[PDB]
């Protein structure tokens, strides 16, 4: 199953995950192609920002769907 | 603050400052409060200032026409005395003395223009002006003229334009209303034509200035001139007779020179209020004081019964208002030019209409847009109308928290978008560093509060603005300071402060009956920024994800273990924390108790030094004064633009949520341009088991005759609680009450009685709000009380 | 007062440095027509403190001006624009010098016909699609950077157009590091060797960066598998687990903790990665540009072409090492010892980079010295972090036979993807062609318009053969704005705008690549190549 | 659910509050959950405010055994956020307190967290009497001494709890 | 059963336990009402500090455990 994550760029790269995999290993897929910490990574499906222990399953990621990097940021 | 107990006074130089101490002696020596007058220069325009930080007089007088300025500034509390002491003084003196349909100030003295004539060459005085030319003929066979006045003056042409229907600003039952003018109607049309007339058929001379028809009076070469109390001393040292006669009427209509109202006002900070309602409505308004102020150097009808009244009596009193000063320069030059034959009295009052509008034509052309006309994509509620731009002009309050950054330009922003009613906090005084991007700041500026400035340069840059600074804090004002707004806006560059006033505004929630009140929820709208990435999102609290909802996003906090920093230094920030966080407390280089301050480039070169050095031991490389500064003051990167983005959105979402003009942000955006440009939005969820806005209160119903041990008994019982031993407390009269504690002795003595007292005696009352808290409850949880009875 | 330059300037330095703010300064850009967009992209301007810009502005203050700008007083209404602006433009720096020329860019394109020439960069707000096309093309020839920004109702529109910009240091916000133990170098294979993992006392067993940990365990491997290095999943995580072993353990026998060896097992995920060229930098090296030389190629390629010789000579087939590792924990001596053989690495492939450009610049007959050492320096810091943008013209945008369709197109998939709001913008400005004057100005007649616009879309859409269809809710939303410019929205577009031209001058980060569409109505937006 | 802000003025009040602060709702919870050691003693003066009291240590061991210390307390308005204003009363020869009451506790300054109670600084003062911290002296004097030579420090101690001085200093007499 | 765990500071924490609870489940809650990660955590018992993995039983414990926390000085 290939899914999107857009970055903080805008970049969006194409991973392969299996809907039994943890939401941190979607992380380090990432990091892989990216260079980007999974401490860092804040990811956002369908509203929701995807807690590390719940899988790709809890979240009903389908197909092509398109995962998003955000941040908040504390700078007046 | 402003000294309790003591009524310091403060009143102009050259008003008598004397007698008036002695109607204060009176005072403490009566009641035991003492009183302290000053007359301190630039009074009227050093109050403003300290009124608005809070301290100041308790008192202090001045006309009118100022305290429309402080009453729209918040600096002015409203007066409430009786109908019965109301009449003691005149019925229109009030109005002069009022703002949005309160009276802020109680009037002490009144002055108004008469005219002024030689008694001897005429013993008749006009009782119009249509006479006055047909004198010039004879005294300038003579030599003279009949008339002669100041002319270069809008003060004292005034009287005869509104005679027949000239108004500065249109009164309505409680308000000015500034976009209605009455000075370009017929009745000033027709005022000034005449007033024109005399100056082309040579009866005057559109020069004659104050000096000019001064020094010729005083000889006794005119019959009359326009003057009034302030004038009456020359005439005597020359003495040259005269009387206060009064103004000629015109085309039927009677005369209306302006009308000026010397009055105290009551300072909104002093919390000496009721103490001012003595010194004043007794100590002051009566025979007794007003005499032995007046005799050092009026309003009450008892000691004015004891021609100047006349004619402020007929004539309109004098705005107090802002804009009214925009007034005086717009039909200044409507006369000059005028009487001076440079475009027709029709083409001048045209002028002078639209000049001292606050409005300009076409000014809110882009808003009007979007609330006026229609579309396929309003927010459902939405209604073309012409009242929410009123709305936004007149009342919608909104608070920006934090001046400078995004601060400076959500304001710049708000105020060029309709809004008016604009209140700005900040903490922080002005900074050299704030300036490459903080554009409402100024070298000069350094070192003075943001917020003021900040208020100061809007106001002046987007005239009808009025900003209301607060060098504050939030964390300094209550859940009451806050419901005023309809709107709350952050700048802010902390997570704690967000945290906070995020929960200030879920607690101002009210959910009646099972549902939420809407109108108890006040929409905030937060962005960040940093560098070249920055977020805006906008919260309904008690409907969609706050600020702890989402307080996961952060990115993970700057942090420095221990055994790094003291024994494993690796990276140059590392050798620049042992300095700030070790070696500087153990030895305190800038003396004894001293503590560290970032600001202070003597203790930033200290650090830097010794942060070399340890560096040095460590051949550790890339320690710099700039990076030092960086990790002690743990400094953001920034720039106009990302705050510009930022503060943009922000401000395009208020506005959508004070008209409806569009449905709000779904909640939430992130930006980021170091590559390209780029933005994503999207609804954060709502966390479930939020510890802030997920907790709602419960009800409990019990008869107001009921007994606290019941509502004891209650929470140790009830199957669904049952509690091992609750802490019960309420606010009641503003302050917190505890009204039983168990786990601390001294207390629950004191608080046992309460246990057998009814709610109705407790001050309990429908709806309130019982704060318990247990070990059962993971944080204390808030029952509702609702009355059976 | 310089030092005085560095305080109020301090924020900023810390992101584009020194050389950044110098290169602004030594800038002058050219804002063309004074409204709140344009007032607001200067102030983000001269604040930062640009060297100078000039407001080309023929029109006068009308009311309306009067009140969505911070920058234009009520008594300004009636006289200049460009001559009002200017002036409030000015208080906000001192350091910058502000002038302006009272005259369309229409006479200036009469007159002088290279008359832009004198600027960095050119900013155009609010222009009609003839004084834009006709200045972008002038400007286009003389190879002028061209910012074209429009704020219609609650949209915001922006076009780059530049030729070439090749950009060195371009600030990736996150990368992959440059460990090399797939591909390891003389003196980083011996540092790694000096190793015994076996002889250290628990401390320094303990305090041991987990680059080496890695480089070590990845030598037993090579072994067990006959010159083999993990590749798969399966195979990283058995990699994993041969290191989790080798933590030292107590006298129970339980497993000391040592997040020495914890982060290699975390870092692993990455530190295995293959060190390889990017196909970006291909581009840039396969590129005529590069493959091509000549006495006019420019600083940029000269010193692409070196890391590509670089490359086929002692790079071995990759880019010069970058010479930074990040932090980890260790002690002191074992970490600073470690970074340093990276550092004189870095050092080192600097100046064999360094002798090939000098080896170009006696080839091309420019002075060996032109390129400084301090500039070469960063060319191999951001070797993997070059980047080449190139802007269509305006022109190839409205050609006939040029205009991008395959995007537009696909874009239309999605009845709201912001591309409706560029279609809505053309057939804007055709209606303001045939009629002289924008739809629903005024409120009577927004009915009237409605239609008319629809046909114009129609007329567009047409002409350039677009199957596409536009929800007529877009045709009602654009007559209602009422060709307005919101405050808000021209402040949105200022600020993007502005760093856009920041990014040109300093030549520091990457810039958009063509059109940038805003839509203040939903808070979204979005880029197109065009 | 849609929201539409009513254009209308809000009802006014005078600045009372009408509900309770977050730092009220907290206290009131650690006050509730209060956990005195035997050798400590809280006191409110009054009952209705639980943002004020003060704590007394009458410590059994280390260096300052058979004294007594009266701390006083202010929470604020920014509680849990921001920690409480802790001050010593009672003048006392300490490396972490000075002479004018400021205390030097970790937890106190840059250590704070809002998981912390009262309960939390209650514990880290007592521990305070048990082993004082050199690395954030308030009495640098002090704080050399008790690293330095631990037995004349312990001397200084009893010494200046008695009633005496320490240098060119009288120290009040503070034992139980 | 009962048994209380001396965090420094002087307070001996009632997390009453079971036997068959692993070491490991104490640190959760000495993580909870404290909100020390179980991670920075080492227990003290004999000399020997407790390990993780094993359980209240392996330790001779009786229905009066008194127990002393010492944190662990981790990150680097
Ligand atoms: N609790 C608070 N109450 C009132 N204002 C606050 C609070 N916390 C922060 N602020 C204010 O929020 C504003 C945030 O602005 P911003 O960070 O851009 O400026 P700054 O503090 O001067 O920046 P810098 O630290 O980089 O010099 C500051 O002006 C600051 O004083
Ligand atoms: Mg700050
Ligand atoms: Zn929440």
């Known amino acids: 199953m290939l899914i999107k994550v857009k970055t903080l760029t805008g970049k969006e790269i194409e991973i392969d995950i299996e809907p039994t995999d943890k939401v941190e290993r979607i992380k380090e897929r990432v990091e892989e192609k990216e260079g980007i910490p999974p401490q860092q990574q804040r990811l956002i499906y369908s509203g929701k920002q995807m807690n590390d222990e719940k899988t790709a399953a809890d979240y009903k990621i389908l197909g092509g769907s398109v995962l998003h990097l955000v941040l908040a940021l504390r700078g007046g | 603050k402003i000294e309790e107990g003591k009524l310091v006074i403060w009143i102009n130089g050259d008003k008598g400052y004397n007698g008036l101490a002695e109607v204060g002696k009176k005072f403490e020596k009566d009641t035991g409060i003492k009183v302290t007058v000053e007359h301190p220069d630039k009074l009227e325009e050093k109050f403003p200032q300290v009124a608005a930080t809070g301290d100041g007089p308790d008192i202090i007088f001045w006309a009118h026409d100022r305290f429309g300025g402080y009453a729209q500034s918040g600096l002015l509390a409203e007066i409430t005395p009786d109908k019965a002491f109301q009449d003691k003084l005149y019925p229109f003196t009030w109005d002069a003395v009022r703002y949005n349909g309160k009276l802020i100030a109680y009037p002490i003295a009144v002055e108004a223009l008469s005219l002024i004539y030689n008694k001897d060459l005429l013993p008749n005085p006009p009782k119009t002006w249509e006479e006055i030319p047909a004198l010039d003929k004879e005294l300038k066979a003579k030599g003279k003229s009949a008339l002669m006045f100041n002319l270069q003056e809008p003060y004292f042409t005034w009287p005869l334009i509104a005679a027949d229907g000239g108004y500065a600003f249109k009164y309505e039952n409680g308000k000015y209303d500034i976009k209605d003018v009455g000075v370009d109607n017929a009745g000033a049309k027709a005022g000034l034509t005449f007033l024109v007339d005399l100056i082309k058929n040579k009866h005057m001379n559109a020069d004659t200035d104050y000096s000019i028809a001064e020094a010729a009076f005083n000889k006794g070469e005119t019959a009359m001139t326009i003057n009034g109390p302030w004038a009456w001393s020359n005439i005597d040292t020359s003495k040259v007779n005269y009387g206060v006669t009064v103004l000629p009427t015109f085309k039927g209509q009677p005369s209306k020179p302006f009308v000026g109202v010397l009055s105290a006002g009551i300072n909104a900070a002093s919390p000496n209020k009721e103490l001012a309602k003595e010194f004043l409505e007794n100590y002051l308004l009566t025979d007794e004081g007003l005499e032995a102020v007046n005799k050092d150097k009026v309003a009450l009808k008892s000691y004015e019964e004891e021609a100047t009244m006349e004619n402020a009596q007929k004539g309109e009193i004098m705005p107090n208002i802002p804009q009214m000063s925009a007034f005086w320069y717009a039909v200044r030059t409507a006369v000059i030019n005028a009487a001076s034959g440079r475009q027709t009295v029709d083409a001048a009052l045209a002028a002078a209409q639209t000049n001292a509008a606050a409005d300009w034509e076409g000014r809110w052309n882009h808003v009007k847009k979007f609330l006026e006309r229609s579309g396929p994509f309003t927010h459902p509620d939405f209604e073309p109308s012409t009242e929410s731009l009123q709305f936004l002009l007149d009342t919608c309050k909104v608070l920006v928290i934090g001046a400078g950054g995004l601060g400076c330009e959500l304001l710049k922003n708000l105020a060029l978008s309709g809004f008016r009613q604009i209140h700005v906090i900040d903490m922080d005084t002005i900074d050299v560093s704030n300036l490459n991007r903080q554009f409402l700041f100024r070298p000069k500026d350094i070192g003075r509060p943001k917020a003021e400035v900040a208020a100061e340069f809007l106001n002046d840059r987007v005239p009808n603005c009025n900003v209301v600074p607060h060098f504050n804090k939030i964390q300094d004002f209550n859940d009451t300071f806050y419901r005023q707004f309809h709107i709350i806006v952050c700048g802010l560059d902390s997570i704690i402060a967000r945290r906070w006033i995020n929960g200030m505004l879920i607690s101002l929630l009210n959910y009646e009956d099972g549902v939420l009140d809407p109108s108890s929820i006040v929409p905030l709208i937060d962005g960040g920024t940093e560098g070249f990435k920055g977020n805006a999102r906008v919260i309904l609290p008690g409907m969609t994800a706050c600020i702890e909802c989402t307080l996961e996003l952060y990115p993970p906090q700057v942090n420095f273990p221990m055994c790094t920093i003291a024994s494993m230094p690796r990276l140059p920030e590392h050798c620049i924390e042992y300095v700030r966080m070790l070696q500087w407390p153990k030895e305190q280089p800038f003396g004894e108790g001293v503590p560290l301050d970032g600001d202070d480039p003597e203790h930033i070169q200290w650090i830097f030094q010794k942060s070399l050095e340890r560096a040095s031991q460590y051949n550790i490389r890339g320690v710099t004064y700039r990076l030092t500064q960086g990790v002690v003051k743990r400094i953001i990167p920034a720039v106009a633009s990302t705050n510009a983005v930022i503060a943009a959105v922000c401000a395009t979402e208020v506005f959508k949520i004070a008209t409806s003009a569009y449905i709000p942000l779904n909640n939430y955006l992130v930006f980021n341009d170091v590559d390209g440009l780029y933005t994503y939005t999207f609804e954060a969820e709502r966390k479930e088991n939020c510890p802030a806005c997920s907790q709602l209160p419960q009800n409990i119903q019990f008869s107001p005759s009921a007994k606290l041990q019941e509502v004891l008994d209650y929470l140790t019982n009830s199957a669904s609680l049952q509690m091992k031993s609750p802490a019960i407390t309420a606010t009641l009269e503003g302050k917190n009450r505890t009204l039983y504690l168990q786990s601390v002795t001294s207390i629950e003595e004191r608080t046992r009685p309460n246990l057998s007292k009814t709610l109705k005696e407790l001050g309990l009352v429908d709806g309130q709000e019982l704060a318990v808290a247990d070990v059962t409850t993971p944080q204390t949880v808030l029952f509702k009380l609702h009355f059976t009875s | 007062g310089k030092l005085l330059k560095e305080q109020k300037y301090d924020r900023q330095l810390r992101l584009w440095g020194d050389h950044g703010q110098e290169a602004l300064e030594s800038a002058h850009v050219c804002l063309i027509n004074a409204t709140a967009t344009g007032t607001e992209i200067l102030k983000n301007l001269v604040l930062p403190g640009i060297g100078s810009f000039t407001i080309i502005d023929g029109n006068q203050v009308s009311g309306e001006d009067a009140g969505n700008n911070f920058f234009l007083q009520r008594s300004s209404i009636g006289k200049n624009r460009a001559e009002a602006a200017m002036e409030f433009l ?241 002690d002191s001596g074992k970490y600073i010892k470690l970074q340093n053989v990276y550092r004189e690495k870095a050092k080192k492939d600097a100046a064999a980079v360094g002798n090939h450009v000098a080896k170009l610049l006696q080839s091309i007959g420019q002075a060996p010295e032109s390129i400084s050492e301090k500039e070469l320096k960063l060319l191999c810091s951001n070797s993997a972090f070059l980047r080449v943008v190139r802007c269509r013209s305006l022109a190839e945008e409205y050609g006939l036979d040029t205009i991008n369709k395959d995007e537009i197109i696909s874009s239309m998939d999605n009845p709201d993807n912001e591309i409706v709001l560029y279609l809505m913008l053309r057939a804007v400005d055709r209606f303001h062609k045939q009629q002289g004057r924008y739809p629903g100005v005024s409120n009577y007649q927004v009915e009237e318009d409605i239609g008319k616009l629809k046909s114009c879309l129609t007329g567009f859409l047409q002409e350039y053969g677009l199957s596409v269809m536009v929800k007529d809710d877009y045709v009602h939303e654009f007559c209602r704005y009422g060709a307005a410019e919101p405050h808000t929205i021209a402040a949105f577009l200022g600020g993007a705008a502005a760093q856009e031209v920041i990014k040109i001058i300093t030549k520091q980060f990457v810039i958009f690549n063509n059109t940038y569409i805003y839509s203040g109505m939903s808070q979204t937006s979005a880029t197109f190549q065009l | 659910k849609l929201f539409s802000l009513k254009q209308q003025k809000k009802e006014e009040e005078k600045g009372s509050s009408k509900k309770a602060s977050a730092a009220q709702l907290r206290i009131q919870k650690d006050i509730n959950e209060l956990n005195l050691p035997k050798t400590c003693d809280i006191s409110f003066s009054d009952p209705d405010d639980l943002l004020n009291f003060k704590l007394v240590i009458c410590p059994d061991e280390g260096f300052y055994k058979s004294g007594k210390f009266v701390f006083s307390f202010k929470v604020g308005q920014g509680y849990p956020h921001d920690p409480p204003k802790v001050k010593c009363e009672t003048m006392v020869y300490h490396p972490n307190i000075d002479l004018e009451g400021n205390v030097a506790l970790n937890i106190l300054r840059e250590d704070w967290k809002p998981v912390l109670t009262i309960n939390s600084i209650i514990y880290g003062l007592q521990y305070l009497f048990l082993e004082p911290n050199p690395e954030d002296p308030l009495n640098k004097e002090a704080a050399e001494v008790l690293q330095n030579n631990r037995r004349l420090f312990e001397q200084n101690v009893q010494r200046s709890m008695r009633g005496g001085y320490i240098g060119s200093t009288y120290f009040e007499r503070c034992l139980k």
């Open chain 3, 90 to 330: 000015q208080e906000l720096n001192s350091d910058v010098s502000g002038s302006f020329v009272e005259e369309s860019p229409e006479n200036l394109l009469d007159n002088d016909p290279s008359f832009f020439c004198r600027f960095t960069v050119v900013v155009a707000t609010q222009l009609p699609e003839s004084t834009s096309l006709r200045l972008a093309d002038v400007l286009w020839n003389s190879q002028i950077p061209l910012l074209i920004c429009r704020t219609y109702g609650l949209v915001g529109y922006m076009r780059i157009i530049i030729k070439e910009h090749p950009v060195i240091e371009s600030h990736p916000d996150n990368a992959l590091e440059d460990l090399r133990l797939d591909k390891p170098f003389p003196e980083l294979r011996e540092h790694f060797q000096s190793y015994d993992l076996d002889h250290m006392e628990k401390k320094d067993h303990s305090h041991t960066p987990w680059i080496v940990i890695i480089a070590k365990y990845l030598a037993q491997w090579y072994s067990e598998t006959n010159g083999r290095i993990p590749k798969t999943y399966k195979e990283k995580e058995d990699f994993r687990d041969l290191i989790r072993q080798g933590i030292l353990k107590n006298e129970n026998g339980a497993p000391e903790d040592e997040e020495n060896f914890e982060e290699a097992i975390k870092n692993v995920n990455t530190a295995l990665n293959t060190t390889q060229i990017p196909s970006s930098i291909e581009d840039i090296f396969n590129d005529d540009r590069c493959i091509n030389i000549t006495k006019q190629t420019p600083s940029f390629w000269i010193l692409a072409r070196a890391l590509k010789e670089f490359v086929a000579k002692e790079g071995q087939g990759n880019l010069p090492v970058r010479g930074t590792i990040p932090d980890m924990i260790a």
